[PDB]
């Protein structure tokens, strides 16, 4: 099903078929600027993630930390910093619970949050 999930995400988005390596890691490019990495991470779950560029200056820190609470809902977007101090955003999702169209939805959220930090 991780591969059936990518089979369907590719459909709800007419794209050739997402090439994965041996760790099922794949990537998609968005508005030509954003690379979203997709990867199974456990037996039950995948990660979608991406690089978004530098920390404003400071104190978007508090604002993310103030929103880094738990949620009843899937697809929440989380932010970390890079070794080299770029925002990294990601979401982790139950692979069986997640339709191809939920995934596209997470990615849009991913790319919204980056636009806003960047």
């Amino acid at each position: 099903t991780y591969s059936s999930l990518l089979e369907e995400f590719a459909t709800e988005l007419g794209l050739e078929e997402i090439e994965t390596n041996e760790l099922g890691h794949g990537a998609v490019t968005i508005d030509k600027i954003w690379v979203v990495h997709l990867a199974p991470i456990n037996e039950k779950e995948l990660v979608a993630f991406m690089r978004a560029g530098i920390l404003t200056g400071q104190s978007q820190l508090y604002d993310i930390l103030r929103k880094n609470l738990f949620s009843p809902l899937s697809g929440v977007i989380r932010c970390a910093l890079d070794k080299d101090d770029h925002w990294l955003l990601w979401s982790q999702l139950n692979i069986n619970d997640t339709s191809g169209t939920q995934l596209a939805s997470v990615l849009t959220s991913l790319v919204d949050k980056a636009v806003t930090l960047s």
Binding site: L13, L15, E16, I18, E19, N21, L23, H25, A27, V28, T29, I30, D31, K32, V35, H37, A39, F49, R51, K83, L88, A104, L107, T108, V111
Partner: peptide, 20 residues
């Protein structure tokens, strides 16, 4: 979601975040 399929120096930045 608006655009489509590829990658470059992240099978580096990726390959790695995938353990960090």
């Amino acid at each position: 979601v608006s655009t489509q399929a590829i990658t470059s120096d992240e099978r580096r930045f990726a390959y790695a975040v995938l353990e960090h």
